Write a protein that binds this DNA or RNA. Structure first.
Ligand SMILES: [Zn+2]
Ligand SMILES: [Zn+2]
Ligand SMILES: [Zn+2]
Ligand SMILES: [Zn+2]
Lengths: 66, 66
DNA sequence: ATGGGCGCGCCCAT
DNA sequence: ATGGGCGCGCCCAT
């Protein structure tokens, strides 16, 4: 029955770096991880102008300025 | 050049229904979709007893009582 | 500080 | 209404 069907846990999103075996369930997850290798921090606090790799961690940090 | 890498768009989560050709990028998209085949409406409003197939839709509905 | 995992609920067309 | 797409933000270990 299709009532007992559970979507199989998968990791279709494989890290593009040949020497890295990480795979993820969601694409947004992989995109964040790739920043570990590139050292990219696309987010910035317009206050202290500090850069972050994740948007959530920046949001968290900005709420503390005042 | 890894710095220019962007995860290509894909849809690895396919509907198990043989007569359905739908594929999603995320599994939570597919878990929702399969309720179209089963007609399941799990989220019920405790104020009016009305049933919905999705929790985001119920959530918004719950607000029409206030 | 920052990463893996992923749920809640928005956008917007139906 | 109710479906596909998908981002914000939380949880909790790093
Ligand atoms: Zn990797
Ligand atoms: Zn700052
Ligand atoms: Zn289907
Ligand atoms: Zn109601």
């Amino acid at each position: 029955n299709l009532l007992n069907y559970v979507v199989p846990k998968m990791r279709p999103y494989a890290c593009p770096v040949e020497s890295c075996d990480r795979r993820f369930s969601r694409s947004d997850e992989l995109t964040r991880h790739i920043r570990i290798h590139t050292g990219q921090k696309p987010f910035q606090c317009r206050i202290c102008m500090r850069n972050f790799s994740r948007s959530d961690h920046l949001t968290t940090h900005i709420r503390t300025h005042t």
